[PDB]
């Protein structure tokens, strides 16, 4: 893009954030959110928008 500001924001629905490959919750990865040694988050796992079932 060639505009004045190149910053943009996308709204993500909470349903998308899930563990990769639909596995269970490990100690350091609860509900698709990475957790460090303390309670703070480090990174998030985002699925892909699948409208068709396949």
């Amino acid at each position: 893009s060639s505009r004045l500001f190149r910053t943009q924001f996308r709204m993500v629905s909470p349903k998308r954030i899930s563990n990769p490959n639909n596995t269970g919750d490990s100690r350091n990865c609860r509900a698709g959110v990475q957790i460090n040694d303390s309670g703070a988050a480090l990174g998030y796992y985002v699925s892909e928008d699948g409208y068709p079932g396949w």
Binding site: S13, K15, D49, G50, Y51, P52, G53
Partner: protein, 31 residues
């Protein structure tokens, strides 16, 4: 959390709406 469970006395044991996106829940019945 009773909301996500079986229910009070099993009254909600058959109410299991699918967890689908808004598009997959709107477009098939649009017309």
């Amino acid at each position: 959390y009773h909301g996500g469970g079986s229910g009070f006395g099993g009254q909600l044991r058959s109410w299991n709406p699918p967890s689908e996106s808004v598009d997959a829940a709107l477009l098939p019945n649009f017309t």
